[PDB]
Amino acid sequence: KKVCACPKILKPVCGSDGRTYANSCIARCNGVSIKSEGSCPTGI
């Protein structure tokens, strides 16, 4: 129940914790910034 709503577009990001979230809005809602655009490589 809010006037704001996050986007539903398929544009995921790697957060500075090294997790991937579905978009920039959901990433910021955890209290953390985006390290880069796109999903990140699990091999590093």
Side-chain angles (χ1 to χ4, degrees), residues 2 15 19 25 29-30 37 39-42 44:
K2 296 185 69 67
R19 251 290 191 273
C25 203
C29 283
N30 277 270
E37 54 178 86
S39 182
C40 39
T42 326
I44 306 178

Side-chain angles (χ1 to χ4, degrees), residues 3-42:
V3 292
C4 300
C6 283
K8 56 176 175 286
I9 319 173
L10 206 168
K11 288 180 70 270
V13 297
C14 196
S16 70
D17 265 285
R19 251 290 191 273
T20 296
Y21 314 89
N23 36 286
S24 303
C25 203
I26 189 63
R28 64 176 64 189
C29 283
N30 277 270
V32 205
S33 36
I34 81 92
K35 199 64 163 66
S36 52
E37 54 178 86
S39 182
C40 39
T42 326

